[PDB]
PDB file of N, CA and C in Angstrom:
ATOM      1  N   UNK G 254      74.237   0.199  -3.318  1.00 54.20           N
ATOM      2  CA  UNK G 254      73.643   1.408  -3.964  1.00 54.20           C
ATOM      3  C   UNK G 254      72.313   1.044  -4.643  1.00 54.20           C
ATOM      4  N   UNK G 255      71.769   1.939  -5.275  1.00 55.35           N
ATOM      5  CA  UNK G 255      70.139   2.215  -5.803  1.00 55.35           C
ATOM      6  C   UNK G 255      70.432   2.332  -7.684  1.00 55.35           C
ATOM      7  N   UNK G 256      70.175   1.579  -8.621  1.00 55.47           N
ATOM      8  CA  UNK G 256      70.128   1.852  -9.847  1.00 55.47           C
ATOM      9  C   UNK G 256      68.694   1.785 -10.337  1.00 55.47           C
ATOM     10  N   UNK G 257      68.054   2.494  -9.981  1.00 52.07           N
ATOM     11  CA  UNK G 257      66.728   2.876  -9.907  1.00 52.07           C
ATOM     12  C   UNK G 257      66.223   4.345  -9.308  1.00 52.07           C
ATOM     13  N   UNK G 258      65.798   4.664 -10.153  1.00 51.48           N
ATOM     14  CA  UNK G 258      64.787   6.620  -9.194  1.00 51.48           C
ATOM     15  C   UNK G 258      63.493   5.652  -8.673  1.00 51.48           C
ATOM     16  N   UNK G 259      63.046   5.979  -7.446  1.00 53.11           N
ATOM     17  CA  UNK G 259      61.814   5.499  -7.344  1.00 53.11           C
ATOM     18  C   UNK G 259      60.932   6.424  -7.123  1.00 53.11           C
ATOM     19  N   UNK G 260      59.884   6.104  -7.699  1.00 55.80           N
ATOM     20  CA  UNK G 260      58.879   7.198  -7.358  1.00 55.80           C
ATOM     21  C   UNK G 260      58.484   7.730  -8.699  1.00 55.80           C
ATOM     22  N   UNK G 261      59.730   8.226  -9.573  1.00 57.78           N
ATOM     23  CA  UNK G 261      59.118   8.392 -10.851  1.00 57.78           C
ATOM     24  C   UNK G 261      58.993   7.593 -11.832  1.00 57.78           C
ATOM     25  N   UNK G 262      59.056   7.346 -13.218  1.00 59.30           N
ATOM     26  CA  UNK G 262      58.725   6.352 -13.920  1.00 59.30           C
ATOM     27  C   UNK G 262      57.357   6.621 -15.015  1.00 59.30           C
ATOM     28  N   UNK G 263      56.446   6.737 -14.712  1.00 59.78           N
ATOM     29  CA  UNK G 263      55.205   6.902 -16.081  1.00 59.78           C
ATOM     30  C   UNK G 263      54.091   6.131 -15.184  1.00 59.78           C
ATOM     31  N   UNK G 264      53.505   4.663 -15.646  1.00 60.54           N
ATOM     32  CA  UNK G 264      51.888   4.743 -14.944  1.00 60.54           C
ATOM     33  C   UNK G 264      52.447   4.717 -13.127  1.00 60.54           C
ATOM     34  N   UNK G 265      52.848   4.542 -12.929  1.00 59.00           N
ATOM     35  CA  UNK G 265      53.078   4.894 -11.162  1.00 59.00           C
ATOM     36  C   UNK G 265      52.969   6.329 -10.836  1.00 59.00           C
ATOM     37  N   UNK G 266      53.862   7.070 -11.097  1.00 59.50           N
ATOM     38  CA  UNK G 266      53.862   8.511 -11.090  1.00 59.50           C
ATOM     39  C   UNK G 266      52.426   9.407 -11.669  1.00 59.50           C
ATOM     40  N   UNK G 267      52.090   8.899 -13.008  1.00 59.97           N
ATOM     41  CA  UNK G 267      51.309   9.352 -13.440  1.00 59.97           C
ATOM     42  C   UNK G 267      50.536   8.300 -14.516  1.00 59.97           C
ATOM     43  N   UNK G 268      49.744   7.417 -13.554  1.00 61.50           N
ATOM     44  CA  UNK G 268      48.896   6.452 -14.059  1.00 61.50           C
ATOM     45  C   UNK G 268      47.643   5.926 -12.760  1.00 61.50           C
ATOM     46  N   UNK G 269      48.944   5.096 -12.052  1.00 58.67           N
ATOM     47  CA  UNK G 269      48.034   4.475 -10.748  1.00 58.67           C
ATOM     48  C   UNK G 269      48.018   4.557  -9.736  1.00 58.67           C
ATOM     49  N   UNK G 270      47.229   6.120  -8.987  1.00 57.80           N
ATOM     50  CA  UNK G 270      47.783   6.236  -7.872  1.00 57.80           C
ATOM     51  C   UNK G 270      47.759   5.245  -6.939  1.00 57.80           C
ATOM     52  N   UNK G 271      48.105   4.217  -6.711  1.00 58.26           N
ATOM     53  CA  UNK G 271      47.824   3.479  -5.559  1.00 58.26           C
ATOM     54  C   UNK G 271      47.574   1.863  -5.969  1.00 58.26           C
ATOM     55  N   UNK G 272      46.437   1.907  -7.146  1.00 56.95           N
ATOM     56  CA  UNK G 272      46.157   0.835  -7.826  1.00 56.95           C
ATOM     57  C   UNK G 272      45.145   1.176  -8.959  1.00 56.95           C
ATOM     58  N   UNK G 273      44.859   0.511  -9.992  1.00 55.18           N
ATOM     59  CA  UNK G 273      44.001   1.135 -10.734  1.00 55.18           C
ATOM     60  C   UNK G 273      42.544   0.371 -11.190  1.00 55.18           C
ATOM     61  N   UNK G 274      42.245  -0.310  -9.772  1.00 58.01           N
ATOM     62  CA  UNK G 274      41.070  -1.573  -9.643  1.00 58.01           C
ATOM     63  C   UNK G 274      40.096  -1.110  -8.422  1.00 58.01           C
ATOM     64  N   UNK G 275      39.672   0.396  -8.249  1.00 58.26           N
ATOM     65  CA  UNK G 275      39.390   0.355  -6.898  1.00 58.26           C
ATOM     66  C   UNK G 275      37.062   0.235  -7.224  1.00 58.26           C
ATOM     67  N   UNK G 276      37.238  -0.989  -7.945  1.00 55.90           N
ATOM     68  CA  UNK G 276      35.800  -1.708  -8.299  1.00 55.90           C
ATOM     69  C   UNK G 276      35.572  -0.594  -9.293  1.00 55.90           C
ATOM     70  N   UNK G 277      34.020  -0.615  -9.606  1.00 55.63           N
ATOM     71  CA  UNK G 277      33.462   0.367 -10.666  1.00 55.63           C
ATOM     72  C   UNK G 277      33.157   2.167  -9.769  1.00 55.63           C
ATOM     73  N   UNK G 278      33.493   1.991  -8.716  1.00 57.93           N
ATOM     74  CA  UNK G 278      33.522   3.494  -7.835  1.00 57.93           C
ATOM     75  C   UNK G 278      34.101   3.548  -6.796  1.00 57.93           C
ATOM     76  N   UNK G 279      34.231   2.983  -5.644  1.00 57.99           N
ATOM     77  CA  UNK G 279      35.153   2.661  -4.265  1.00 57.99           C
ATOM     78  C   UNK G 279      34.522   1.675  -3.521  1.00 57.99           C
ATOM     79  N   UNK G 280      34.802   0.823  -3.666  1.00 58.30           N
ATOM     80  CA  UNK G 280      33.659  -0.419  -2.353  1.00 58.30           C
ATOM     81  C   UNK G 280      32.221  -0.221  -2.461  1.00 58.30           C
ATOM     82  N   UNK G 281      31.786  -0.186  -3.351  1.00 59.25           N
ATOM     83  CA  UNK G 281      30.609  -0.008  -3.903  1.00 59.25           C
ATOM     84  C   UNK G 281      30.138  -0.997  -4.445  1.00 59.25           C
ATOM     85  N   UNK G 282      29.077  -2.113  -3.799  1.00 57.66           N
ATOM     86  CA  UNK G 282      28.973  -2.989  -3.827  1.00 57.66           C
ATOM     87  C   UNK G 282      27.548  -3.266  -5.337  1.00 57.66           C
ATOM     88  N   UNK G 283      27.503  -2.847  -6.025  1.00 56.83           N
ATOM     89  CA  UNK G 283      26.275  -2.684  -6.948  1.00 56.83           C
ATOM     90  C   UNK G 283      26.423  -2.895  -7.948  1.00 56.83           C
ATOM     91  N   UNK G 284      26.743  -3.993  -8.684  1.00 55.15           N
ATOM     92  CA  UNK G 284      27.228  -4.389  -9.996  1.00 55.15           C
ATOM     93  C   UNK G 284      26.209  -5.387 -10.780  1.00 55.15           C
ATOM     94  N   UNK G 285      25.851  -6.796 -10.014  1.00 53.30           N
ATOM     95  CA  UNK G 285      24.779  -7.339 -10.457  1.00 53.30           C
ATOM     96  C   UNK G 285      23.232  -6.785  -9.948  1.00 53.30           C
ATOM     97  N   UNK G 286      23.121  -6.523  -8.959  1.00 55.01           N
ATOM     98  CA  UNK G 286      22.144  -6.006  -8.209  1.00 55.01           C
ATOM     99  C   UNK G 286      21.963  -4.272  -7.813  1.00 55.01           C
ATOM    100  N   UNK G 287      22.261  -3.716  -8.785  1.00 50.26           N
ATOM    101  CA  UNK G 287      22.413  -2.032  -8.601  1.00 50.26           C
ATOM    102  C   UNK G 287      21.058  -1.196  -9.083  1.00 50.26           C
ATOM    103  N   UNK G 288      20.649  -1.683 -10.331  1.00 49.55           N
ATOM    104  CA  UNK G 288      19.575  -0.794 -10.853  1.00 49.55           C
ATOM    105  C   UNK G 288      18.318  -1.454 -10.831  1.00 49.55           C
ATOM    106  N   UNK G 289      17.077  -0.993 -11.323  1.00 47.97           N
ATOM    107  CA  UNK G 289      15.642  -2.003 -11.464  1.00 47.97           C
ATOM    108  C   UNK G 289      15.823  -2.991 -12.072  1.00 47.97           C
ATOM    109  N   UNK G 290      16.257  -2.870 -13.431  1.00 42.35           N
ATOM    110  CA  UNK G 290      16.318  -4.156 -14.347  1.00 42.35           C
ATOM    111  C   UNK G 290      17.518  -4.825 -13.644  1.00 42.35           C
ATOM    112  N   UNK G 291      18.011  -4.947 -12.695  1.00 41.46           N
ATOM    113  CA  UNK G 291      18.822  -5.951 -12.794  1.00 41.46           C
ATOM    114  C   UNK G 291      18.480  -6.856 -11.950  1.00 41.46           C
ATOM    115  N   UNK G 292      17.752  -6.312 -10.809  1.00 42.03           N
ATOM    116  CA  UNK G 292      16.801  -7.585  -9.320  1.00 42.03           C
ATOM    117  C   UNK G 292      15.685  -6.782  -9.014  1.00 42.03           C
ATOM    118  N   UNK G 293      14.788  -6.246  -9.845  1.00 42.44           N
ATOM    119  CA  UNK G 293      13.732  -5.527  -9.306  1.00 42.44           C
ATOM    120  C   UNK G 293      12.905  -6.546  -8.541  1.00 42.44           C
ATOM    121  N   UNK G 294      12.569  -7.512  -8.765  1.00 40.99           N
ATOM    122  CA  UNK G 294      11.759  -8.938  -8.141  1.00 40.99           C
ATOM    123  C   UNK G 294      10.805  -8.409  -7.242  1.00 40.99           C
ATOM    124  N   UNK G 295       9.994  -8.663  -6.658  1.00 43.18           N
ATOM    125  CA  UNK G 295       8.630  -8.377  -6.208  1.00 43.18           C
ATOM    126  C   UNK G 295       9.142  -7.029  -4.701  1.00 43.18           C
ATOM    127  N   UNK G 296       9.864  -7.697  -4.097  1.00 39.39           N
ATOM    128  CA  UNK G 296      10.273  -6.242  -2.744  1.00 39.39           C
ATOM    129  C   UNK G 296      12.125  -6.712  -2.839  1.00 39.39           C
ATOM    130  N   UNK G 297      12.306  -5.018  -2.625  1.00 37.24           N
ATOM    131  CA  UNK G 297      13.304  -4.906  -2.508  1.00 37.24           C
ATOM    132  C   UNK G 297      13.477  -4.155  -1.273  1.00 37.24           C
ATOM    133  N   UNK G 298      13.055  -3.335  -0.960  1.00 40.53           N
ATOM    134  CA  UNK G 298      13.967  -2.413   0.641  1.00 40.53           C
ATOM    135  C   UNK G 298      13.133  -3.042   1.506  1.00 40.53           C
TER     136      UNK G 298
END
């Protein structure tokens, strides 16, 4: 037998859908190198 409900509970149910690390937006690679001040350096694109 099951001595457990699964599914409900508190941060699972209603915390993390899935996980609660998905970076600073979704695979969004721009953390050290995102804005001017952070690698503006002579050319960038």
């Amino acid at each position: 037998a099951l001595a457990r409900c699964p599914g409900c509970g508190q941060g699972v149910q209603a915390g993390c859908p899935g996980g609660c690390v998905e970076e600073e937006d979704g695979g969004s690679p721009a953390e050290g190198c995102a804005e001017a001040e952070g690698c503006l350096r002579r050319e960038g694109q």
